């Protein structure tokens, strides 16, 4: 279970905590929602994990030769399963923001969805640093 | 080309030396090499400075390059002194053959420098740094400089001996001579090894080291699955090397070993030994210390030619060991083994690697006399030949009635299947690594992985099948043991690991096996 | 399993989220479906994982060497048919798409075909990156 | 089976989705047919899976030493035969394409043959990239 | 035994034979007599020969534990007295010599004593090295 | 034994033949005999060989415990006389010459002795390389 | 048995055939008889040689203690004799030149003896190359 919990703007990780952060402002347009997906593209433990789960089930049927078909028929099911429930346990709810700096431009981020309900047209305040920036919401 | 300076004779030699062919385009490297190919010479002319620095006049309009080469010659200057401080161990003798200039001689900076960096390499200085005689302008020195025990614990786990402990204290100068002194410490489930151990790296000015071995291997037997019997051992070993090829080695020496044989379960492979030696005791009951002390010298001799130290997959490594007594101490034998190594790569790109190791032995008693039964050799097992359980290899034993007991009704010799050893060995083992799949192939190249195929045959060279009808003769000359499998070995911050299941396709009765074992620490 | 699901405009990658990324608008011709093909060149797990499975599915024939012999030709025909298989669950469709952007240019780009439909003549907020371009419709 | 199946028209590497493609105009020369080669030069798992079934059909004739034999003869027939096929299931159709754009000036291009069949003379909109050039017919 | 030996006028060692030496003159004043240590300062090779031969003559008195402590306390013994007799065995007279270069100086330098006895006023010719010197008397 | 033998000038090595050296002429006074060590400081590998021998001298006298330390007893003194006696091995009759150079100065050379019995008043050769200097008498 | 059979002015290495060397001419004065030494000083190879051989010969005297006390003496002897044999081995018969080349100096080179009788002034080429000079008549 990787840590998809540090993609919110209300939730800090301690890499980047006593520090100093450069601060823009804001004005909003155009939430829409949108999931987010995290981790690896292999989920190599997902896989292990399911393995051998789908493969000592295996040992409970059968015997002599058809006990060790079904010991591997169990192990490989087992471990395509496995990555297809590690992949999905990381499938978390997010936003993405169209914000109008008010220096004049647009820029878009996109972040873990949280308690605050933003509105398309409020004030953000922007924490900058080198290419890492939170909306917080006032 | 052009030349603006005194060359002292190299003049004309510009075009052969430091040519390069007309319409070639503005390079940095072949252009610079006109500049670089008398830039090194010149300390033959015993000139200490050889500068050469070009600087053409970059023609764009139709493009021709016009080189202006200021060539001016240094100076002869000379060799006097080799001054290094704050060291207390290294030499101004092999840290003056590791450089390129001896003393008294024509001397320069840039003909220097093919010696100075060479001399880190001895893995002892943290950095290796690099005069005209102070106030006086002809003669000159060439001057370095240099910036100069842990301990360490081992605990391990494993199959063969489970838990697997290391603590030892090294210290590689003994007070500023170069002298490297090593403390070791294990502790497993059948022997426990603690040893001291010296030795002087020079001992001749010209490669000769010399090393003196105090050990102590209080060992035991049953833990380890053979039969039973018990050592606790000390003895005392000292050698002799000298580099001949920095490719090859080769040692003498003279060891001095001293055992406690006793515990003995009664079994006619090692009752052969205890008559011909001239020890009988009671042939049920186990009560009985045979003590030997045998002086032996011994030899060696090495190879090496991998490129990568870690996880290799190039070169050829090889070893030879031999051995023999005095015929003037306890019991007199000799022993002699042979090791191999080979990691072949196909091509450049290091993918498909090709290792197979094989090792030979062969030991024998002289006058008659026996070879130590706890000397013989084992095969089969984890380290060697995967897929058997370790030493389960090797023509059984066979037990006497003693307390097979005589309260069952025990009455013959009692066959048994219990591995013992034996005295010549044979294991070859092809391998044939492939790549790593299945992880993030930006890192695919690391945890390695190979299918093997392989054989262990010792034998008892003196079993007997005259007297054993029953029995098999086991000293057949081809009772090989063909086994096949996966492992997956690698690097992690908790120490070396493998993991493996080896099937056992080929064996005979008797023949235990072992699909599976594993290595976290040490074996 | 092969991930090549965050291909689409309603997912985005753990890397790709609270970072800023420019904004441009432009116009849309020319969509036409596309197949999109995620993941190794090798497929050498699903390759090995048809190896054992197809090997197993030998012992269970015949007796002695004929027996043995069925026991590898049902693993490298197992072990085919494993690739054959996983390439055929990483076929994705997905559109393509010629933007024209107010700049004054064109451009194209494909996607994961998502839920939202994209037609011949629209308002599109290209959303850009370092080189990585997302096409939200509205 | 080498995934040599991303070289057409109409199926795309996922390394190249998101990603932005430049577009150029064109007209089409001397269409002709050609064979697409992709993969290996040695084939070595078609090398294993021929010689493992190579092998084990040789033990099923003779016996004592005319055995040991036939089961090695078998294993390296076996061996050449498989990267014989091997490099027979990757000979795929394909097309080369002389074409025109309105810079002034030629290039060709080659590509998977799929289901759209080019014409002597037409418009075709490439798609660019890093050295990377598709054909679309329109 | 460290052979400093060859800290002498009436020897050479085997690096300064066929070498070139210059020659300066000298008048000599303040003569005094001095001692020459030469060598390791670890004494290693007489650590270990007292040590042996301490411990082997320490199995000679009393029996059981009563032996185990004698073989423990006669090494150690023997093992201090192997430094304390090894430095003593390099300890060698010799002189110390003060002499005015007729270049106009004045330069002082030691030397293993000889047959040759020195003078206060005499004339010595300075064999001169790489800053290795040797004085001898005419 | 260290070849104590080409420190003459009757006996050359074998990287200063076939090569090219220097040739000067002097006038000579003030011959003095002088003796030559040479070699390494330890006599390095005659050590070994007195100790070895004087070790299995020891096995022949006594018994039990009381042959044991004259096996010590005799290795350290062996130990100890083959230093003393490897040393006397190297010694050599040798001669210190001085030279005046045609050129106007003078210098010292040192050389193993030979046939030759030089004298205060005559003419030598000195031939010269890399800084070695033979002297041969003519 | 060391090769310094390559050092005449009528035997050449390997390394130094099909190369080109130049030619300078002169004059010859002075030839005198020299002889030549060519191997190592350590001669770790003829100590072993004789080593065993001096002690196998041990074996054949005596008995018991005796015995292996012999086998010890016969051993350091042999290891004596081996370097005392081996370095008397590699004397080689030599001559010393002085050349005047036709250029203006006076040259020294050394030389293994062969067929051909100098004179002290004769007509001697060098064939020079990157400090190596062999001196053919005429
Ligand atoms: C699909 C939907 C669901 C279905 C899924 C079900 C799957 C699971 C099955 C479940 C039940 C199963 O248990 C049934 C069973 O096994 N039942 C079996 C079981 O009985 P029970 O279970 O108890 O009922 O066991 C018995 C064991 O039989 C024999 O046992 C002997 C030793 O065992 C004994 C003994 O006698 O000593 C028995 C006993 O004494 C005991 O004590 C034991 C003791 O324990 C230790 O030995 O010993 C062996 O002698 P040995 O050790 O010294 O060798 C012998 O080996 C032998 O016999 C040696 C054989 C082996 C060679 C045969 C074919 C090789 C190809 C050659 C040319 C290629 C074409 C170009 O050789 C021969 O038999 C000689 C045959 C000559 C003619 C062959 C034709 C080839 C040319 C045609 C050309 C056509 C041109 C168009 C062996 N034959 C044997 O065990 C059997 C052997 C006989 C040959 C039959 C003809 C097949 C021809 C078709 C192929 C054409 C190719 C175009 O069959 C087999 O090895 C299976 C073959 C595997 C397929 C491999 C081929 C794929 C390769 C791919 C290449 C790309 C069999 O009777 C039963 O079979 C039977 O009841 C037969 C059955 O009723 C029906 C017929 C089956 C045949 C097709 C199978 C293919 C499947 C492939 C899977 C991927
Ligand atoms: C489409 C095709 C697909 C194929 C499969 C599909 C269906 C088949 C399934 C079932 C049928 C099959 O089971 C039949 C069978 O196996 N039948 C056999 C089976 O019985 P079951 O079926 O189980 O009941 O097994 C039994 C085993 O028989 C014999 O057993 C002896 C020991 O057994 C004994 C004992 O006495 O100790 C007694 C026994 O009872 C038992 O107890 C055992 C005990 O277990 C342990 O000892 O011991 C062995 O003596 P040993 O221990 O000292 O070694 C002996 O081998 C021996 O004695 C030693 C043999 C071996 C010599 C081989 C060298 C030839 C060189 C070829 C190059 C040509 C020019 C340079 O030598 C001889 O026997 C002397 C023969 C001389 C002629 C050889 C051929 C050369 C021709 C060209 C010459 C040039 C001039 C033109 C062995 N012969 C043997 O096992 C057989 C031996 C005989 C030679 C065959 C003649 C024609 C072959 C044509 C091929 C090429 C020609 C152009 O043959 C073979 O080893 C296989 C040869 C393989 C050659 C491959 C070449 C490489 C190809 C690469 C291509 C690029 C036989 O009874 C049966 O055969 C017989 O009753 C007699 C019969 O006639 C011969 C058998 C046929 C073999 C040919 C097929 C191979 C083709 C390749 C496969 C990929
Ligand atoms: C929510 C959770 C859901 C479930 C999960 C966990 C539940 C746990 C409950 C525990 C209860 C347990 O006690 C049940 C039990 O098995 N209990 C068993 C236990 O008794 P207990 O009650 O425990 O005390 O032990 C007994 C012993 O079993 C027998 O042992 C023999 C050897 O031992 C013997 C002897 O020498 O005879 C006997 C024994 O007494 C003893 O003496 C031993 C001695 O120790 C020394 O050996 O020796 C074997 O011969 P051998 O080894 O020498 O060769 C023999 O199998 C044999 O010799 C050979 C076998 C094997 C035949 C191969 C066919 C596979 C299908 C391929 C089709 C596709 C092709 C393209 O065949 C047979 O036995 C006869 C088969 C007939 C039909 C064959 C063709 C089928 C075609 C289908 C096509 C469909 C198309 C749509 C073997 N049969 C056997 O063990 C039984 C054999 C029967 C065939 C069933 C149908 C097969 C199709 C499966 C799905 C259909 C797909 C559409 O089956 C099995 O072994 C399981 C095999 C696993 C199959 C995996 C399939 C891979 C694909 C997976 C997909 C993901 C069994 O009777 C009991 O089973 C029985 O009482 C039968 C009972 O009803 C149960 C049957 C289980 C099947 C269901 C699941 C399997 C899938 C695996 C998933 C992980
Ligand atoms: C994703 C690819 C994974 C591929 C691995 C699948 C291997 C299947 C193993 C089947 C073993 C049957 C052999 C004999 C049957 C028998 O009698 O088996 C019986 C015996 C144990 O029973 P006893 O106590 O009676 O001995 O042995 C076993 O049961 C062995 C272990 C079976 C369960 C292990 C689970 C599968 C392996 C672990 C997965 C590792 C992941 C690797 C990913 C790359
Ligand atoms: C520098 C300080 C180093 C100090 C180390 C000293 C170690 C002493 C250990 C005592 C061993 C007792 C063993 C068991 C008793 C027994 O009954 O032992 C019995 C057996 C044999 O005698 P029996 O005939 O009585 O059985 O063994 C011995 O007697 C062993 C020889 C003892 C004497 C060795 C002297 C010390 C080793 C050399 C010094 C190394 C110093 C190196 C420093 C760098
Ligand atoms: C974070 O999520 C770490 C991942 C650890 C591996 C997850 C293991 C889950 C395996 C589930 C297997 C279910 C099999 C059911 C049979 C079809
Ligand atoms: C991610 O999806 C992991 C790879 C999945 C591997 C699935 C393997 C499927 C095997 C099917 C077996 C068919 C074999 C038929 C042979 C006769
Ligand atoms: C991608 O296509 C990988 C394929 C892996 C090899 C499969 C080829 C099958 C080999 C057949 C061998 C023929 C046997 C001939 C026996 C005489
Ligand atoms: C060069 O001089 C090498 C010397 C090697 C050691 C020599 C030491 C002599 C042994 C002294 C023994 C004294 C025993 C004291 C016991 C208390
Ligand atoms: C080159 O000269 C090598 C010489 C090697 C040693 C030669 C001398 C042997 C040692 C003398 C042994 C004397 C024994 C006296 C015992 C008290
Ligand atoms: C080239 O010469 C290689 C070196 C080989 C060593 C030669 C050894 C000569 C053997 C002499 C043995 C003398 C024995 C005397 C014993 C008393």
């Given at each position: ?71 591997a028929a169990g192990a490989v099911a087992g471990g395509v399963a496995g990555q297809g429930v590690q992949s999905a346990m990381n499938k978390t709810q997010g936003v993405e923001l169209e914000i109008r700096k008010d220096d004049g431009n647009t820029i878009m981020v996109v972040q873990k969805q949280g308690n605050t309900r933003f509105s398309p047209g409020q004030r953000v305040v922007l924490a900058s640093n ?9 | ?242 580099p001949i090829n920095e490719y090859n080695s080769l040692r003498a020496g003279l060891g001095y070993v001293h055992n406690s044989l006793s515990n003995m379960q009664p079994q006619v492979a090692m009752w052969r030994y205890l008559y011909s030696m001239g020890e009988h005791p009671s042939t049920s009951d186990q009560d009985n210390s045979f003590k030997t002390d045998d002086f032996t010298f011994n030899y060696g ?126 294991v070859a083992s092809l391998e044939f690594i492939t790549p790593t799949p299945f992880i993030s192939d930006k890192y695919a190249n690391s945890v390695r992985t190979s299918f093997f195929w392989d054989m262990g045959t010792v034998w008892d060279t003196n079993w007997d099948s005259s007297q054993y009808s029953g029995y098999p003769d086991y000293s057949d000359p081809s009772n090989i043991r063909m086994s096949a ?39």
């Open positions: 279970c990787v840590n998809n919990d540090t993609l919110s703007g209300d939730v800090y990780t301690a890499s980047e905590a006593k520090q100093v952060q450069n601060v823009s402002y804001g004005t909003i347009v155009n939430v829409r929602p949108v999931q987010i997906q995290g981790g690896d593209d292999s989920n190599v433990i997902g896989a292990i994990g399911g393995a051998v789960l789908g493969g000592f089930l295996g040992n409970t049927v059968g015997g002599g030769t058809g006990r060790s078909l079904a010991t080198g290419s890492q920036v939170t909306v917080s919401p006032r | 080309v052009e030349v603006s300076g005194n060359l002292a004779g190299h003049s004309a030699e510009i075009e052969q030396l430091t040519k390069i062919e007309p319409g070639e385009l503005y390079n940095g490297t072949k252009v610079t090499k006109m500049e670089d190919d008398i830039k090194k010479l010149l300390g033959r002319y015993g000139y200490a400075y050889p500068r050469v620095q070009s600087m053409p006049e970059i023609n764009d309009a139709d493009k021709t390059v016009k080189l202006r080469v200021n060539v001016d010659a240094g100076n002869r200057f000379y060799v006097r002194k080799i001054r290094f401080e704050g060291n207390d161990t290294s030499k101004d003798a092999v840290l003056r053959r590791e450089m390129r200039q001896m003393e008294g001689a024509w001397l320069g900076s840039d003909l220097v420098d093919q010696g100075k960096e060479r001399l880190n390499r001895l893995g002892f200085f943290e950095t290796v740094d690099t005069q005209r005689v102070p106030g006086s302008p002809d003669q000159v020195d060439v001057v370095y400089k240099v910036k100069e025990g842990s301990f360490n614990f081992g605990i391990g786990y494993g199959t063969e001996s489970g838990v697997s402990f290391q603590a030892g204290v090294q210290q590689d100068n003994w007070l500023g001579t170069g002298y490297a002194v090593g403390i070791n410490g294990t502790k497993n489930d059948y022997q426990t090894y603690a040893e001291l151990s010296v030795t002087n790296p020079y001992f001749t000015v010209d490669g000769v080291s010399l090393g003196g071995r105090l050990f102590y291997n209080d060992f035991q037997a049953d833990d380890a699955d053979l039969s039973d019997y018990t050592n606790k051992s000390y003895g005392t070993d000292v050698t002799l090397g000298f001799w090495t190879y090496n030619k991998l490129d990568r130290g870690y996880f290799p997959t190039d070169g050829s490594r090889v070893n030879l060991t031999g051995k023999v007594t005095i015929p003037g101490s306890d019991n007199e034998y000799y022993k002699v083994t042979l090791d191999t190594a080979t990691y072949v790569p196909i091509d450049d790109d290091h993918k498909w690697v090709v290792l197979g190791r094989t090792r030979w032995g062969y030991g024998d008693g002289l006058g008659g006399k026996e070879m130590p039964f706890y000397e013989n050799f084992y095969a089969g097992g984890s380290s060697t030949v995967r897929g058997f359980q370790s030493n389960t290899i090797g023509p059984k034993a066979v037990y006497f009635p003693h307390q097979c007991a005589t309260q069952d009704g025990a009455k013959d010799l009692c066959k048994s299947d219990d591995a013992v050893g034996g005295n010549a060995m044979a499998g996966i492992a997956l070995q690698w690097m992690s911050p908790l120490g070396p690991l493998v993991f493996s299941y080896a099937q056992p396709f080929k064996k005979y009765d008797g023949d235990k096996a072992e699909q599976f074992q594993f290595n976290i620490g040490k074996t």
